Design a protein around this ligand. Sequence first.
Ligand SMILES: C[C@@H](O)[C@H](N)C(=O)NS(=O)(=O)c1cccc(-c2ccc3n[nH]cc3c2)c1
Ligand SMILES: C[C@@H](O)[C@H](N)C(=O)NS(=O)(=O)c1cccc(-c2ccc3n[nH]cc3c2)c1
Ligand SMILES: [Zn+2]
Ligand SMILES: [Zn+2]
Lengths: 403, 398
Amino acid sequence: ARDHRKIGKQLDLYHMQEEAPGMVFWHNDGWTIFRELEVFVRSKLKEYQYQEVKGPFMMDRVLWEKTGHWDNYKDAMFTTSSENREYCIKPMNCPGHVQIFNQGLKSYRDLPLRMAEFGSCHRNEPSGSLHGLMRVRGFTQDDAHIFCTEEQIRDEVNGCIRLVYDMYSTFGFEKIVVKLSTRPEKRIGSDEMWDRAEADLAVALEENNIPFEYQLGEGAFYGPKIEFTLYDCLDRAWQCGTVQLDFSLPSRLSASYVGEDNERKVPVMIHRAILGSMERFIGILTEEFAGFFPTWLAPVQVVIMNITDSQSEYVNELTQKLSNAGIRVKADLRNEKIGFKIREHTLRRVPYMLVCGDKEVESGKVAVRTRRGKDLGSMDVNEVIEKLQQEIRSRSLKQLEEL
Amino acid sequence: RDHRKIGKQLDLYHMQEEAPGMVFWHNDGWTIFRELEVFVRSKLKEYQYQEVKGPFMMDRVLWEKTGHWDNYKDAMFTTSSENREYCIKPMNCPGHVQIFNQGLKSYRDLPLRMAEFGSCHRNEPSGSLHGLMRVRGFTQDDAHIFCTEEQIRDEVNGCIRLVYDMYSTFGFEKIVVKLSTRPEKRIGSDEMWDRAEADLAVALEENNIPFEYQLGEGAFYGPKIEFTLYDCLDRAWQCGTVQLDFSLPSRLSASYVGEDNERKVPVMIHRAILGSMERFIGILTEEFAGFFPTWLAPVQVVIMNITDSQSEYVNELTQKLSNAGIRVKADLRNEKIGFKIREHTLRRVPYMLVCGDKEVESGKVAVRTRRGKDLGSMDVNEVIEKLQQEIRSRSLKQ
Ligand SMILES: C[C@@H](O)[C@H](N)C(=O)NS(=O)(=O)c1cccc(-c2ccc3n[nH]cc3c2)c1
Ligand SMILES: C[C@@H](O)[C@H](N)C(=O)NS(=O)(=O)c1cccc(-c2ccc3n[nH]cc3c2)c1
Ligand SMILES: [Zn+2]
Ligand SMILES: [Zn+2]
């Protein structure tokens, strides 16, 4: 079956070792993909008007007792101690986000406050359940919590729902199934609060014309969940996105704002992650493309090769020029024959391969080749640069000219 | 002027007793952090560094082999899973060596320069914590350079030049250089330390760099050049560092196929330019007294109306500047114009663009700076161009 663990070794993306179970060593080229995904999410955070923060890796166990995590996550939480106190390594970003909200006086005028983080979390998942990038102990969530009034729930859940379909469409995921995860057996909050949170999410889905199934007893301890599963090109299901309505944690953590009539009020909190674990999302993408990443995600977008020693200076000039123009480009000046070089970069799935022989030096042009074997012939360097810039800017799925 | 007070006033970050020495970065402070990462990335691109990311914890067994367990125990946070013990990472070096150890390397791959914005933790004594300067959770602009004996000079020189190159951008006038020599508890022979210490002094002298000795303060694995920066009370803080390590690669089985097909162990150079991102932000906060240069300022431009009558226009320009890459916010509040100007002056926002009825007809903007200087009427294209130029060149002034 397509396997990201094999593709990832082939393409030198990352590795794992038993010295750090379920924790990824990101090699240069894999980290390049991770960083480009973060650039993409940030573009969406800007458009959708989110803050971006960073909360600490560890906080005192007492805070985690207060939230309800200690009772409901105890087993899954890594603990460490210093000077007679115990700290939990964070399994979730939400408590940190509340501590940031709690700094200073908040007004109804500050709401809806949308707070995002690339949140680096750890959970002590059983070793026997771990699997490549898909099931890890250290994962990074494209997380956010929205602080809002009850009157704002509708519009904010809607914005989260749009964002899911918006973002998945960029990667070519258009087949999406939705579920509503209802009250678990171990939960905090009254049944009436639950009645209300569940109906709020059902109503949002209904008004969006999104059909769903129930997922009985699978909501969070703090609130119910809209869960979004995409299907890939092999029609495999991946549950990724989550939208969660929380009437419990803010009160538990003494969060408040001053309302219009100057009465003190507790905000509602919406939790959401669209990609889920970025580690897992990269694993899925690697399998979806079978290594043929779109140019905007490809770790190396262009390799420029000499025929021999003769054209080294020209290829060096070209490499520098394309790099200044923001393309991930490298020069292959090695000993070997032209066909040894192109095979190597073809198997590395580099989008474009520029060939530079004696006649290219004198014309100021490049012979352009793709990783799917297409001969794009001689091209001017400025044309090559402009078309790649356009491909990258637009985050296009396919290369030049095809169906 | 204290970074801690300024931090509160500009809403950059906070700390709490629930996590001593752990920073909560608010939006505006995280903004600064992120620009610094962009800047570091630009500088390392010209030097061909890779960028990686290693795990947050690794097995105690690995930390025993590196010598951290014996030479660094009280300073490490530990945790357990399924009866195995892990240290939360105090350093990124061992993780980088694990990546180097994947795949056969040859002399052709050297020098190999491997960088990481590495989030580490050290169990610093609580009484020694001080604001952003000394924290328990820190991020280094770290790198390790894997190289041959013959390449040490060149690569140490390259690190030294990178420190003065990057520091020139912020305009530091006082950079104190210390050479830190073998500590009491250390790994490696006295002969290795003789040769390591000599290489670093030779390198300083080759660049004609005035320096002092700081005996007994080097790392357990090797000597350190330290580039020292100073806070508003003139307290010293290590920022830049360049270190020479002939120990860890052998300890961790790193090797490469030489010129003559014999196996060799590479030399490692450790270096950080800014140091800790937290400490560096502390230093920059006091250095500039909050008036961050335009390229680093969390909000570069605030656009304000007088009344609801100009809102549409303020929104028009706010989307226009934003689309040009400028960090811009609209202030649409039913507050007096002098209340608005004072908040944004206090927040140290480089530029304030005021819009009344007059500006809506003319299609211009009234421009004022956080220094209270009146810049008069300007066209929106000239303001966009001025700013893109200040941002792109990363200028210190104006
Ligand atoms: C959405 C967040 O604000 C919420 N606080 C949360 O973590 N929800 S969640 O537990 O359902 C969640 C969301 C996304 C990812 C994960 C998660 C958790 C652990 C994992 N290991 N490998 C992949 C993993 C993914 C959990
Ligand atoms: C250069 C690195 O590769 C090296 N392995 C190292 O960690 N050297 S170092 O211990 O001297 C060092 C370098 C940079 C920052 C810190 C550091 C360490 C702990 C801190 N707490 N608050 C600010 C801190 C700064 C330590
Ligand atoms: Zn959450
Ligand atoms: Zn190091």
